Design a protein around this ligand. Structure first.
Ligand SMILES: C[N+](C)(C)CCCC(=O)O
Ligand SMILES: C[N+](C)(C)CCCC(=O)O
Ligand SMILES: C[N+](C)(C)CCCC(=O)O
Ligand SMILES: C[N+](C)(C)CCCC(=O)O
Ligand SMILES: C[N+](C)(C)CCCC(=O)O
Ligand SMILES: C[N+](C)(C)CCCC(=O)O
Ligand SMILES: C[N+](C)(C)CCCC(=O)O
Ligand SMILES: C[N+](C)(C)CCCC(=O)O
Ligand SMILES: [Br-]
Ligand SMILES: [Br-]
Ligand SMILES: [Br-]
Ligand SMILES: [Br-]
Ligand SMILES: [Br-]
Ligand SMILES: [Br-]
Ligand SMILES: [Mn+2]
Ligand SMILES: [Mn+2]
Ligand SMILES: [Mn+2]
Ligand SMILES: [Mn+2]
Ligand SMILES: [Mn+2]
Ligand SMILES: [Mn+2]
Ligand SMILES: [Mn+2]
Ligand SMILES: [Mn+2]
Lengths: 131, 131, 131, 131, 131, 131, 131, 131
């Protein structure tokens, strides 16, 4: 039994290649082999969002604070709220982030395929970031 | 993209074979194949706890409310608080639950092996439910 | 400065005169004089709700988990979700609780008038517990 | 019954006169007369903290995410965690904020005295911001 | 006297333009000219509902199983239970469907005008469905 | 006297091991000891049916809606209609379900032996699902 | 034969340097030379505990009421219950006290060396008290 | 058979309306109907005592620790010790508490009439709290 106490994992800033705007990543877990799952808490400041991206074994988001936006390619921009659970399919191109006026925090849970949790693609333009 | 809106997943009661005392299970997600991960929010009333059990690809707990206790076989009873992240290895025999006078909720995340996410064993006696 | 550490305040059961169904009350704070504000976390099991009641200086609810229902006298039954903030006026007769199949937790904040924070009235019938 | 739905109140940035570092204020409620209580959710980025200040009728903090620091004048710098409840007395000079490496969010609840919730004083120096 | 024996009319799936979620339509009758009335049994899975729509000569619902929700545009969401009779006025924009966690079946009876019994409008958003 | 009100028992999905196709289970009652009887409403979509199975103390089916099929091992496939009552003897291997083009709902009443109410066997093949 | 009748020895409050929280000391005996043993009854309110300390010839605790916690530096926190006997070795750094929500009383028996029965050390932090 | 284990019943504080000074109440049992009896352990700090009060079906006190005082209206103040058993008749006005320099714990056993176990009256004044 390994316990990582609250406060023991340092926060980090969202890399510019992965996010538009100011994002904070709070690591939560990375399961050891042979388990595949990993998780992090991601807080988007107002107006911030991921680039477009895919996950090789899909991704589950559990919104935990605030009010955010998310979209898959070809779909509508949806508003997501604390307690909502979002599922993105393997290889489904999508983004998520804060709404323009409110921050959002979600717990992002995904299984790694050969250690790889994500494939990063182009940023979400100001023209795409609207609803 | 699938959104399971808050309040769209009914609460359920913890089966007597899986728990001592009163427990509520709030499902969150069961990822479709080829993904294997599932998650649920589990609320333990004071004094309530799981039976001893194992998970075939381990388990991650993220405490979200209250103050609980947990223990692996042969180890000390540890207190777990909101924001704490607990990892149980594959095959590691353990229990978790509320502290004696305070409820606890955690998010339990585990990957399934051949559809199975848990192996239930004997209950945690009052003598074992003690630091 | 006083810190009441998590797990240091015992859970309690909701009295039968104050609630229909099973409810747990987790005290959070009762400010000392000259301050008048108090707060508690209240968890309603599915189908559980307060009796009809009023607060002498009003009440604020901040939903923190699950999906619940609330109603003021003469009004419609409204659903309240995590992150929602509800205000009941002084003397406004109301109830709140879980939805029929999902639990709900809220933080209830109210100022006391002459030490009193609530006036309890009749229970919410099954007929009234309906949108 | 007034409901402010999650996402309906825009976030704001912590004024420089009130905070060192980057802080976000999410308003929650301001009770109408004759009630005095007000509340906001305050998220401190790593290293950020309030200036020294007092509240005329005291203040209650409920930590809801992350891991922060707080101190009253003449006291030790304490680490506070989600679920902890902090009470500052009327007129007690104090500060609160993130820890150096982790963000913290708290719900700050205070009663206003003649509409006034706080008296702002000098900033917390880098020499005082240590533990 | 014409009798259509139970089982002799095939079920159909609810078109995507007419419903959110999974719905089954079981035709019952369409009276020949000069009569104008038609009827169908409609079964909504949990969370499923009609698009917003109107009927040119109004509509009567008789709930026959489960527990559902219905709303006129501009009014409150109300629960409808087996044996309840619902009337929508001519041209009244409304929706009906299941509750979030329980299915509902109703018998829908409407008269046609110029050979048309319904005017389909925009879908009912997740926000509209709950509020 | 215990009343489970309409809408208070959430609908569930039929497990793939117990059913071919899409089935919804609406629980009605499970008598506490020393009573042994339990009942549920089961709705089969067109073409859906149970696996072959037995019940240790027999089973009564009361058809409540639609039109379905049922068969015991070595017998013919029979069509059943609302108001028909079907009895399967203890240990009698059988299946029931919808017809290919119409849904069917039945009330299934069975007594438990050693807490078990059913013994699940092989699925009903497409070749077997014919009249 | 010297008898000190119950009630004849006044209670005292536990000094701030020796305890965190509210503690009452009820002296029982201090044997005259050449005997070395002394004893006292100590009642800890919920959450109260000794500072870290050592005893030069060890110490025996006999729990007489309530439910408490104790820890040797470097070991696990263990619960001690009425009738339990605890032994701390000479020079063993430890603390004892109440559990977080229940008081505890123990009888503390220790022998003096050079007229001293205890060596007081630093206080037990909130982090140490729980972990 | 129900066992409430040591440490499972949280300690409470004596309300100011029921006691002068600092008192702790440790609940032991409240028999369910048709039984009427309830019991609690009450610990009075030095100088603390109940208000004057009565019990509708009388009260038995079993002193379990320390040395205290007790008096019925019109009687003398008596000293009571561990193992002493005190009976107050129905409707007899009395008080009990610690002595001025020693704490006292008693087990208070009383039967409820109309769910009420006590009728609280005026506080015991400093002039009355003397022997
Ligand atoms: C890669 N990670 C988890 C740190 C951030 C991506 C989260 C998301 O997909 O929204
Ligand atoms: C399997 N699940 C999530 C339903 C219950 C397991 C709870 C736990 O492992 O602590
Ligand atoms: C008074 N309190 C907080 C213990 C219960 C009130 C719950 C509510 O008003 O919804
Ligand atoms: C004034 N307010 C509530 C917006 C921020 C101060 C919060 C605090 O005292 O830590
Ligand atoms: C279009 N129709 C009549 C077959 C189904 C619409 C049912 C309803 O209005 O609730
Ligand atoms: C086992 N139960 C009641 C959940 C479903 C069985 C339905 C049937 O036997 O036809
Ligand atoms: C110092 N003394 C003996 C009066 C009290 C210390 C009790 C303890 O070591 O737990
Ligand atoms: C009412 N109760 C049992 C909580 C305290 C009364 C103590 C006493 O009567 O002396
Ligand atoms: Br929904
Ligand atoms: Br504590
Ligand atoms: Br929406
Ligand atoms: Br036939
Ligand atoms: Br600490
Ligand atoms: Br005497
Ligand atoms: Mn993603
Ligand atoms: Mn587990
Ligand atoms: Mn209220
Ligand atoms: Mn402050
Ligand atoms: Mn309609
Ligand atoms: Mn069957
Ligand atoms: Mn010691
Ligand atoms: Mn008494």
């Amino acid at each position: 039994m390994e316990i990582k106490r609250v406060g023991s994992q340092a926060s980090g800033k969202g890399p510019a290649d992965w996010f538009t705007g100011t994002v904070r990543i709070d690591p939560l877990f990375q399961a050891p082999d042979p388990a595949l799952v990993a998780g992090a808490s991601v807080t988007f400041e107002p107006g911030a969002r991921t680039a477009w991206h895919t996950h090789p074994l899909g991704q589950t988001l559990i919104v935990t604070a605030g009010c955010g936006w998310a979209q898959r390619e070809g779909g509508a921009v949806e508003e997501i709220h604390p307690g909502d659970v979002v599922w993105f399919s393997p290889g489904e191109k999508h983004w998520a982030g804060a709404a323009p006026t409110t921050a959002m925090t979600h717990l992002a849970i995904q299984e790694r395929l050969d250690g790889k949790a994500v494939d990063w693609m182009e940023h979400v333009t100001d023209e795409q970031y609207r609803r």
